[PDB]
Structure formats: C-alpha cells, structure tokens
Amino acid sequence: GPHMATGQDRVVALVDMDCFFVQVEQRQNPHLRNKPCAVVQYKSWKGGGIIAVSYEARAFGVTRSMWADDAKKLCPDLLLAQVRESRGKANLTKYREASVEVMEIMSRFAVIERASIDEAYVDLTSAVQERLQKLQGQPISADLLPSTYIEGLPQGPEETVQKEGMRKQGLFQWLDSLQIDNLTSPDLQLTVGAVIVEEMRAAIERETGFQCSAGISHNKVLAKLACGLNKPNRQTLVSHGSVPQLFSQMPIRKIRSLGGKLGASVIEILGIEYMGELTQFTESQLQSHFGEKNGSWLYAMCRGIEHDPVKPRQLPKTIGCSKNFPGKTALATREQVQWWLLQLAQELEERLTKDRNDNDRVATQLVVSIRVQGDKRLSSLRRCCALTRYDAHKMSHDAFTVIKNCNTSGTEWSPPLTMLFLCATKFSAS
DNA sequence: ATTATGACGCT
DNA sequence: AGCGTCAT
Numbered sequence: 054g055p056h057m058a059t060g061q062d063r064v065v066a067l068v069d070m071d072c073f074f075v076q077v078e079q080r081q082n083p084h085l086r087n088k089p090c091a092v093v094q095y096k097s098w099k100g101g102g103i104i105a106v107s108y109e110a111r112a113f114g115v116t117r118s119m120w121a122d123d124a125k126k127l128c129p130d131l132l133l134a135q136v137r138e139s140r141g142k143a144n145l146t147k148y149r150e151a152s153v154e155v156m157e158i159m160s161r162f163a164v165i166e167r168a169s170i171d172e173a174y175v176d177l178t179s180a181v182q183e184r185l186q187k188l189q190g191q192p193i194s195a196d197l198l199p200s201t202y203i204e205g206l207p208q209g210p211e212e213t214v215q216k217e218g219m220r221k222q223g224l225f226q227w228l229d230s231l232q233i234d235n236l237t238s239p240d241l242q243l244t245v246g247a248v249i250v251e252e253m254r255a256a257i258e259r260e261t262g263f264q265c266s267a268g269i270s271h272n273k274v275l276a277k278l279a280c281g282l283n284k285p286n287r288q289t290l291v292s293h294g295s296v297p298q299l300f301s302q303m304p305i306r307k308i309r310s311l312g313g314k315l316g317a318s319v320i321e322i323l324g325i326e327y328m329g330e331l332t333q334f335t336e337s338q339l340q341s342h343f344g345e346k347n348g349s350w351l352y353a354m355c356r357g358i359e360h361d362p363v364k365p366r367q368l369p370k371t372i373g374c375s376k377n378f379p380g381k382t383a384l385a386t387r388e389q390v391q392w393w394l395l396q397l398a399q400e401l402e403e404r405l406t407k408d409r410n411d412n413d414r415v416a417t418q419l420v421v422s423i424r425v426q427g428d429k430r431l432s433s434l435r436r437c438c439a440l441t442r443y444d445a446h447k448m449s450h451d452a453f454t455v456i457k458n459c460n461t462s463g464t465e466w467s468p469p470l471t472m473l474f475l476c477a478t479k480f481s482a483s
Numbered sequence: 484a485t486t487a488t489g490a491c492g493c494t
Numbered sequence: 495a496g497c498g499t500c501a502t
C-alpha cells in the first residue's frame with residue numbers, strides 16, 4: 054500500500070525523427086518532398102539496399118532492408134536518394150551532421166541521452182517542476198497539446214470516426230480529469246512534460262525542417278514504446294495508469310531489450326505472449342529463469358516501473374568505420390586487406406580529427422574487428438592496439454599487425470574476409 | 484548479398 | 495581482454 058513504489062518519480066521523453074535519412078535528403082532536394090521516397094546504399098547489387106523509407110512509400114509496402122529493385126516492384130514511382138560513397142564505402146557524414154543539428158536543439162531544453170543517430174531520451178523532471186511553479190493553478194489548455202495522443206483514451210461514451218476527432222476526444226477526457234492544483238501529481242507532471250515536448254518538437258521543425266515523434270512517460274522503456282504508438286509527426290503520453298490495459302495485449306518482443314533471444318526465452322519458458330502476463334510471477338521466479346538482474350528488471354517493468362537513468366551524454370562514445378565484403382567480393386589477398394584497411398582508416402582519421410577539434414577529446418584505443426567467410430556472427434575476431442596518433446597509415450598498419458596472424462596461408466588471405474571494422478574508443482579530455 | 488555502426492553485458 | 499546481445 055503506502056510503501057509500494059509506482060515508478061512515477063520522473064518525467065522522461067524519447068524523441069525520434071520521422072524517416073530520418075529520407076527527411077535529410079528531402080530537405081536538400083525539394084523534388085523528393087511529399088513523395089514515395091527511400092534512401093539506398095550501393096546501386097550495383099539489386100539497385101541498392103534500402104535503409105530508410107518515407108511514409109508515402111511505406112503505404113506501398115516498401116521497407117528497410119529491401120533491395121531497391123524489389124521495392125520498385127511494389128512502388129514503381131518510388132524515388133531514391135543515394136548515400137554518399139567515399140573511398141569505396143558508404144559515408145554517413147551528412148546524417149551525423151543533421152543529427153547534431155537536432156541534438157543541439159534538444160539540449161537547450163534539458164539534458165539528453167543520445168540513443169541513436171536519430172533519437173534521444175530527455176529527462177524532463179526539473180523542467181516540469183519549473184514550469185509547474187511559474188504556472189501555479191493555471192489550467193492546461195488543449196491548445197498547448199495540438200499533436201498529443203493520450204494512450205488509452207477516449208474510453209466510454211459521431212466525430213469519433215476520423216483520427217483527429219478521436220485524438221481530441223481522448224485529450225479532452227484526460228484534461229477534464231486532471232487535478233491541476235496538485236504540484237506533485239504524476240499525471241499532471243506528465244502533461245506538463247508533454248507541453249514542453251510540443252515546444253521542443255516545434256523548435257526542431259522550425260530550425261531544421263525535420264519532423265519527429267515523441268513519447269512522454271515516467272521512464273525510458275515506456276517513453277520509447279509510447280513514441281512509436283502514433284508516428285509520424287505526433288507525440289504520445291503513456292501514464293502509469295494506462296499500463297495494465299496497454300500491456301495486456303502487448304507482445305513481449307515490443308519492449309526494448311526483449312526483441313531478441315531473452316524475450317523469446319521469456320515466451321517459451323513461461324508459456325505467455327503479452328507483457329502484462331508477467332505480473333503473475335514472483336520476482337524470485339523471474340530471477341530463477343532469467344538471472345538476478347533480468348528477473349528484477351522484468352518484475353518491475355511489467356508493472357510499468359524501470360529505473361535506468363537518462364545518461365548525460367550527447368556525443369557518441371566510440372567512432373567507427375565498417376565495411377562488409379559479401380559473397381564473391383570477400384577479401385582474399387593481403388594487398389586487398391591492406392588497401393581496405395587504409396580506406397577505413399582514412400575515413401576514421403577524418404572523423405577523429407574533426408571530433409578532436411569539436412569536442413576537446415582524443416581516442417586512445419583502436420579496436421579492429423573482422424568476419425571470416427562462413428561465420429554467422431558480426432565479429433569473428435576483435436583485437437585492440439594503442440591509438441597514439443591520428444594518422445591513417447599508422448592506424449591501418451597497426452590494424453594489420455594485430456590481425457595478420459588470422460591468415461592461415463599465403464600474398465593470399467584465407468579464409469577470405471567478409472567484414473572489416475575499425476573503431477576508436479577510450480576517449481580522454483584534450 | 485540485410486549494411487553501417489552504436490551501447491552495454493558476461494566472464 | 496575478447497566475445498555475445500540488442501539496437502537503429
């Protein structure tokens with residue numbers, strides 16, 4: 054009763070750009086705007102591999118990982134923008150720089166955690182407290198929440214046939230039920246968080262041209278889940294009270310970290326399908342199947358409770374360059390391996406020198422990873438060496454020295470390499 | 484031949 | 495340190 058935590062202590066948002074690489078290309082090329090469009094990498098094999106898809110193109114069934122030639126069968130008028138190629142490889146610099154634009158705007162509002170190139174978590178607890186104090190007892194107008202969905206609403210008892218009418222009816226029920234004179238009300242705190250996130254999203258769109266979606270809840274897992282509920286160009290508030298019904302039909306795999314083998318094991322060992330079904334197990338039972346850490350996490354998460362903090366980190370902690378060499382193109386000679394290590398190392402040096410100038414830090418460790426032909430894993434081997442100078446020839450020579458004894462017999466390289474990966478790690482202030 | 488590349492856990 | 499998992 055009075056001592057059971059409810060996981061309502063924080064306001065956390067997850068902001069995620071809508072079809073991000075597509076919007077970057079559409080801002081640059083107005084002919085692509087408001088059209089079925091996708092971003093592709095590498096044209097020669099099957100038209101290239103799609104890595105981002107506009108919502109207009111998704112309506113035809115175009116998806117990430119599809120070959121462009123196959124996407125064109127579903128959507129003959131599909132427009133395509135190609136990732137830049139430099140030194141024989143895809144180069145993602147344009148999208149990293151667009152990401153920095155968005156992250157720098159978000160960081161004006163609150164401390165962010167960079168979770169991917171196109172999304173960040175926001176800890177809004179302090180910002181909400183401040184807004185609630187300057188705005189004491191004032192009601193919250195629906196006009197301050199023009200793109201917000203309240204998950205689970207409307208419920209109960211004609212315009213509720215179009216989606217915007219449903220959105221507003223749900224929002225009206227929520228606001229009509231708020232206790233606005235209670236500064237410690239979790240529901241009120243989430244609502245003010247949503248007001249701030251509307252402002253944040255308006256600033257992003259105003260200052261970059263890019264649209265995004267967002268989730269607002271009490272922790273990162275619920276904010277991430279909420280964000281996807283009403284994409285694109287909308288934000289969703291998931292309250293603590295909404296959790297039982299939301300989770301009652303929510304496949305386990307939809308919760309972040311449960312989309313792989315662990316979630317599969319939860320389903321198979323417990324014989325359940327939905328996140329809410331987890332409430333019927335004791336914490337010790339869950340720890341017995343999934344380990345102490347996972348068991349405690351699952352016990353809390355199925356009740357809507359999670360404590361993982363929004364880490365104060367706007368910048369990536371590693372800077373890496375990778376290229377696959379599939380099928381017949383696998384690297385089979387020592388000259389080949391050395392040339393591609395140099396290409397990767399030259400891109401890496403460019404990115405590292407810029408990083409040192411921008412961010413006052415230097416990487417101190419170089420990690421080299423390879424995949425051997427026939428291995429299913431993303432890395433067949435990983436070895437590190439010191440990164441003492443931002444020099445591409447030195448980095449590539451060192452990488453070759455750490456991996457060269459993976460070569461069983463030469464001039465020749467066997468078995469052939471199907472992936473090379475260089476990663477700079479262990480940054481220190483400079 | 485689903486690529487480029489991020490974070491973090493385990494031992 | 496090096497491998498495994500999960501993610502966009």
Ligand SMILES: Nc1ncnc2c1ncn2[C@H]1C[C@H](O)[C@@H](COP(=O)(O)NP(=O)(O)OP(=O)(O)O)O1
Pocket residue numbers: 069070071072073074075104105106117170171172284285486487502
């Ligand atoms: N598996 C992958 N491989 C390569 N690039 C990828 C990728 N997944 C995503 N990207 C790149 C390309 C993506 O544009 C970007 C962000 O990924 P999302 O946030 O998962 N998806 P998006 O923003 O496109 O659409 P929306 O969020 O509206 O559903 O990262």
Ligand SMILES: [Mg+2]
Pocket residue numbers: 069070071072073171
């Ligand atoms: Mg996105």
Ligand SMILES: [Mg+2]
Pocket residue numbers: 069070169171172502
């Ligand atoms: Mg994303």
